[PDB]
């Protein structure tokens, strides 16, 4: 969210009707995930010695 602009020069009368004013909604920010993956292929023929 963010506060409304300064909106200067907002003079009013001491006694008068309260105008409806103004507002501003929020903003939605979204992101997505990423997949990371590794692989290890080792044969027993190689995993036999020391």
């Amino acid at each position: 969210d963010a506060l409304a602009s300064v909106d200067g020069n907002n003079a009013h009368v001491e006694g008068s009707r309260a105008e409806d004013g103004e507002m501003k909604p929020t903003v939605i920010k979204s992101n997505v995930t990423q997949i990371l993956r590794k692989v290890v292929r080792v044969s027993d023929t190689a995993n036999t010695t020391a």
């Binding site: 909604p25 903003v27 939605i28 920010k29 979204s30």
Partner: protein
């Protein structure tokens, strides 16, 4: 008044019943869910409410 007290409490009770009658008639009506959003509840405008 003879068969009541104040003309406000009596009317309020009468409205408390009329709201139920109109409610039942509405729940059993054939209205087509008149709304500005037609399948746009979860499919509304993007993060900016245009």
């Amino acid at each position: 008044n003879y068969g009541r007290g104040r003309e406000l409490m009596y009317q309020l009770e009468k409205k408390g019943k009329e709201i139920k009658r109109d409610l039942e008639k509405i729940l059993l009506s054939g209205q087509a869910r008149t709304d500005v959003l037609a399948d746009q509840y979860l499919t509304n405008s993007a993060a900016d409410p245009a």
